[PDB]
Design a protein around this ligand. Structure first.
Ligand SMILES: Nc1ncnc2c1ncn2[C@@H]1O[C@H](COP(=O)(O)OP(=O)(O)NP(=O)(O)O)[C@@H](O)[C@H]1O
Ligand SMILES: [Mg+2]
Ligand SMILES: [Zn+2]
Lengths: 17, 186, 568, 299
């Protein structure tokens, strides 16, 4: 789902940073 | 029903077998305490954990139920090493677990072993509690007895030997008691 | 069962009441799906989904309460906001059961950390005082403000009626005095605080509360009033009441400039004209030295205590009120409430006895009916007094003009006398300033900026932040070079005091000098005391010492002490 | 076994927090690192207040589930290297210990156990007594001394960490072209670095940080500390090293450089230690010595 992508991005930033 | 016997057997075998290097430290302590008429034993948590972690797990989950069983196990061991009568022995504990500040205790800690510290600010006078207690039945004049222990009881109503709705009274003339005291920690 | 409603289908309430419409299964499932879709999708203008970020920080602190802003919920899916306003007790159950799903999407097996999460609502867009509440508000969400009058201790409470418990606490809330109309008494209400919210507030605070307004039967009320009258309670849902690198750089920038000490003193008490020495002493007390202690049974205050003798009307109460508004924490007249703060006294046997023990120690002790306990004072004391009737007498020493024992004067750091002197020019300056301030305050953005910058050389918001920063961060130390000179000056002052027959100077004065020098160093954020700090401290203490003496002794002292009071 | 600093003593949280590898991997010297550790424990399903409990008293279920919890979670933080195998010993009922903890206890006992020439003689004589304080701890009959050693080891690592954060946050590392230079002019208590082993522990801390901070420029490093009684700097030359998880070995070249400058220099210096990579030099002579060193092509 593209609309909820910001939520998962905030989740995934823990992996990235 | 059988679980009450296995736990007592386990603690009885704990006292009779724990060596560190060459001295049965708890057999020696329990003998040396009796000679000066001190009926108690000071167990250390770390040694109990080292001996068998399952016993410590059972003790940690349900202290209020399991402490009396270990006390009566201490009595059963105490009779063997000194007789070819004694009261019930008091268990005392030492621990190094993390101290909880007094301000942080809350509903999550109810019925858990807790280690804390503070300043004593007041002390009550001594008061009497009952351990062994004798009973007289009012109607038939039959008699019986009850054994109390002080962990979290009322007089029974199952009349014996109709015998009536609430016939029991206490014979203070043939009963046993212990001391109790209250304190305040700041 | 299987089929679901559309959001447009919920526009028509089809049952006879709201609560009987929310509680139906298909409607409830639709609301749960829509709330989950809202929580996973709402965005800032920059994207940057706020609630994904908040759920992330929920686990970082091992917390239990998620916070939701009402305006966001009203900005989209408005009907859910309406239902929440009308039926909070159901809507919050559904919302909590959605919030647990949202948090487990970030942190699987968070149920092992906490079993249940509570949603806190914020920024509810309508407010009542305790006057406007009526029976129509029952079971509706309300937002209320007031002062907390009384607080119980925390207890556990049985959760279900295998066993589980939760924390509990009750709070009494009262109307703020500013809100109460004239000629009416204030009203009261009582608030129930549950698991996460206990001990969130202290007595005397001014607090803002959101929660459900609820009622129940009470036999005693019915018996006494003789009418079927129910009692009402509020169940709280949420309760309401640092610096960046830029602030630090700004502080360091102003501190690097010359004359920052003088500018800070000038900013002190803008509304009051003159009396520079009083402002200096007050600033020094507010900053303070460093508390120190030595094994071998010795200790030294960081706190600086000041006493001021005022002629009638010489601005003492106004500066005390100013300090009350300026300082971080304070008491005005109870020493427990002054812990690491400032204590203020405006007028004056048991009270004096308590003050004797307070100045002698830094901790208070008491016993009662077998109980024994101890408490901490650890505070700076600023006091003022009227000099033994209508007017001070300069011909006499300090003791004649006060109702105080000698150890009080011995143990205070700074002593000063303020008098209504006669001078035409000073009177004209005072009158012009007074009428100018009076006009400037008349009830009848740029005006405020001009007014502010004319009032003071430093914006007082920055000054308060600066004071807090300096108090929390800066801890100065003495330099060992010049202390030989300080010892020689101390010996010389003692010799001169004995020579004229004055009461001698003492180690208390020397300790006060060092502590005041530390305060001067702290005021410019300097971790080192310097020679000019010691000079200023020596001047302050010597002048204060001179002011306490008789006139002939005063003349001899000032003639000899000229190389300290004026020169160095 | 896990490369966690004394896992089976203190607590799990302290085991992660003071680990030399975890500091390099997650940057624990600032809050943006410490929040990662809190975040990890939140995702792993371990309540943070239980993670700080003493590891002996920690709940049995977490103890037995820890071996599987790490397999699912350490990958997300780039921390898979924590897992390895090691040797563990136990005697009777008194509990287990691994070799990795044992050696830390012994080294702690060596370090901390209890005009100019006389003071140097006294210091070196004091350091010799700790050899016997460690020798007697290799006996099973004297576990009491080993426990004391562990208690000292924890404090040593604490003090080292509290100095490393100060070095990094104030940015005292000077980035010269050929090598990295760091000199400690002051500290909370600089006496602890007067012993060589403590100095090498601090150097190993900084080397892990420098190794993981950037992919580029594996360089030699020089670390020094002043003493107020001698007015001499104690200097050590340290190599880089490659990460754990990654081929001939490199060699420390500071020995020949220090020897050559010592042969040349006017400076007042000492070389008598068995490890020639450590030298001593008076206060005023540090800067000319280092000037001649960097001018030399031997680095
Ligand atoms: N610059 C000023 N200098 C002196 N008085 C001032 C000044 N500005 C205002 N005042 C007024 O003068 C009084 C200041 O002294 P203050 O001590 O506060 O009064 P007071 O409390 O009634 N006298 P007292 O009861 O002895 O404390 C107040 O009434 C002020 O309104
Ligand atoms: Mg006044
Ligand atoms: Zn009967």
């Amino acid at each position: 789902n593209p609309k909820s992508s910001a939520f998962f991005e905030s989740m995934v930033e823990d992996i990235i940073e | 029903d059988d679980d009450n016997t296995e736990i007592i057997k386990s603690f009885k075998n704990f006292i009779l077998e724990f060596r560190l290097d060459s001295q049965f430290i708890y057999r020696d302590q329990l003998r040396n305490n009796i000679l000066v008429k001190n009926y108690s034993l000071t167990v250390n948590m770390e040694h109990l954990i080292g001996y068998n972690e399952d016993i410590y797990k059972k003790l940690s989950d349900e202290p209020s139920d399991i402490i009396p069983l270990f006390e009566t196990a201490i009595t059963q061991v105490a009779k063997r090493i000194s007789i070819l009568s004694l009261p019930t022995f008091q268990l005392i504990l030492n621990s190094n677990a993390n101290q909880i500040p007094l301000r942080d205790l809350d509903s999550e800690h109810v019925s858990k072993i807790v280690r804390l510290s503070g300043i004593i600010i007041s002390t009550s006078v001594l008061s009497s509690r009952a351990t062994y207690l004798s009973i007289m039945c009012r109607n038939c004049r039959h008699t019986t007895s009850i054994t109390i222990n002080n962990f979290n009881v009322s007089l029974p109503r199952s009349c014996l030997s109709n015998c009536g709705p609430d016939p029991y009274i206490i014979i203070h003339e043939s009963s046993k008691f212990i001391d109790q005291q209250f304190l305040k920690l700041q | 069962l299987r089929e679901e409603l559309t959001l447009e289908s919920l526009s028509n309430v089809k049952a006879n009441s709201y609560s009987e419409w929310i509680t139906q299964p298909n409607v409830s499932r639709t609301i749960a799906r829509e709330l989950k879709s809202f929580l996973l999708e709402y965005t800032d203008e920059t994207g940057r989904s706020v609630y994904g970020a908040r759920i992330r920080t929920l686990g970082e602190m091992n917390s239990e309460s998620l916070e939701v802003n009402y305006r966001h919920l009203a900005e989209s899916k408005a009907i859910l906001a309406l239902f929440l306003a009308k039926c909070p007790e159901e809507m919050l159950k559904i919302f909590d059961l959605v919030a647990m799903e949202a948090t487990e999407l970030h942190y699987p097996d968070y149920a092992r950390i906490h079993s249940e999460i509570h949603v806190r609502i914020s920024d509810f867009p309508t407010i009542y005082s305790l006057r406007e509440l009526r029976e129509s508000n029952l079971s509706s969400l309300v937002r209320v403000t007031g002062v907390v009058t009384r607080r119980t201790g925390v207890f556990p409470q049985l959760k279900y009626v295998k066993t589980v418990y939760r924390n509990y606490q009750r709070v009494t809330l009262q109307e703020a005095p500013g809100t109460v109309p004239p000629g009416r008494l204030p009203r009261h209400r009582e608030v129930i605080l549950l698991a996460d919210l206990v001990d969130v507030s202290k007595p005397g605070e001014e607090v803002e509360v959101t929660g459900i307004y609820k009622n129940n039967y009470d036999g005693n009320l019915n018996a006494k009033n003789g009418f079927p009258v129910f009692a009402t309670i509020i169940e709280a849902n949420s309760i309401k009441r640092s610096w960046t690198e830029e602030e630090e750089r700004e502080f360091r920038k102003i501190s690097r400039d010359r004359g920052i000490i003088d500018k800070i003193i000038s900013s002190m008490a803008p509304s009051i004209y003159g009396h520079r020495d009083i402002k200096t002493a007050v600033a020094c007390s507010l900053f303070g030295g460093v508390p120190k202690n030595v094994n071998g049974k010795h200790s030294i205050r960081g706190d600086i205590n000041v006493l001021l003798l005022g002629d009638p009307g010489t601005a003492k109460s106004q500066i005390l009120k100013y300090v009350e508004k300026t300082a971080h924490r304070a008491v005005f007249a109870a020493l427990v409430l002054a812990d690491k703060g400032v204590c203020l006294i405006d007028e004056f046997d048991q009270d004096r006895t308590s003050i004797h023990e307070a100045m002698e120690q830094q901790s208070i002790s008491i016993s009662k009916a077998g109980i024994v306990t101890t408490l901490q004072a650890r505070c700076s004391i600023i006091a003022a007094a009227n000099p033994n009737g209508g007017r001070y007498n300069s011909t006499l020493p300090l003791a004649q003009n006060v109702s105080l024992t000698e150890p009080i004067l011995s143990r205070f750091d700074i002593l000063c006398v303020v008098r209504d002197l006669v001078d035409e020019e000073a009177d004209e300056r005072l009158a012009t300033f007074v009428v100018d301030s009076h006009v400037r305050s008349h009830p009848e953005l740029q005006r405020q900026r001009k007014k502010e910058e004319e009032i003071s050389p430093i914006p007082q918001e920055l000054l308060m932040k600066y004071i807090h920063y300096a108090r929390t961060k800066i801890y100065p130390k003495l330099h060992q070079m010049d202390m030989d000179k300080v010892s020689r000056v101390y010996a010389d002052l003692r010799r001169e005091s004995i020579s004229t027959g004055s009461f001698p100077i003492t180690v208390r004065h020397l300790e006060s000098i060092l502590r005041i020098a530390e305060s001067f160093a702290k005021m410019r954020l300097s971790e080192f005391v310097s020679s000019y700090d010691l000079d200023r401290a020596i001047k302050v203490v010597v002048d204060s010492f001179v002011d306490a003496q008789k006139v002939s002794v005063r003349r001899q002292l000032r003639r000899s002490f000229a190389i300290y009071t004026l020169g160095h | 076994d896990y490369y966690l600093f004394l896992l089976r003593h203190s607590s799990l949280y302290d085991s992660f927090y003071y680990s030399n590898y975890v500091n390099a991997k997650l940057s624990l010297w600032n809050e943006n690192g410490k929040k990662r550790l809190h975040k990890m424990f939140a995702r792993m399903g371990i309540p943070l207040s239980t993670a700080q409990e003493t590891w002996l008293y920690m709940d049995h279920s977490i103890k037995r589930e820890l071996g599987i919890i790490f397999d699912k979670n350490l990958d997300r933080y780039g921390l898979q290297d924590i897992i390895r195998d090691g040797f563990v010993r136990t005697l009777g009922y008194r509990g287990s210990i691994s070799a990795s903890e044992f050696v830390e206890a012994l080294t702690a006992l060596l370090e901390v156990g209890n005009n100019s020439a006389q003071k140097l003689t006294n210091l070196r004589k004091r350091w010799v007594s700790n050899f016997w304080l460690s020798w007697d701890a290799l006996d099973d009959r004297k576990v009491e001394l080993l426990n004391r050693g562990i208690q000292l080891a924890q404090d040593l690592q604490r003090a080292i960490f509290n100095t490393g954060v100060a070095i990094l946050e104030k940015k005292l590392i000077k980035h010269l072209r050929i090598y990295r230079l760091c000199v400690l002019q002051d500290g909370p208590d600089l006496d602890l670095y007067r012993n060589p082993l403590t100095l090498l522990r601090l150097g190993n801390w900084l080397i892990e940080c420098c190794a993981e901070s950037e992919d580029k420029q594996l360089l030699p490093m020089v670390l020094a500390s002043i003493d107020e009684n001698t007015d001499t700097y104690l200097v050590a030359g340290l190599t880089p090293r490659y990460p754990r998880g990654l081929k001939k070995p490199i060699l420390n070249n500071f020995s020949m450089a220090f020897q050559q400058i010592t042969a040349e220099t006017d400076a007042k210096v000492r070389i008598d230690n068995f490890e020639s990579s450590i030298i001593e030099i008076r206060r005023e002579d540090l800067s000319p010595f280092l000037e001649k060193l960097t001018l030399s092509g031997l680095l």
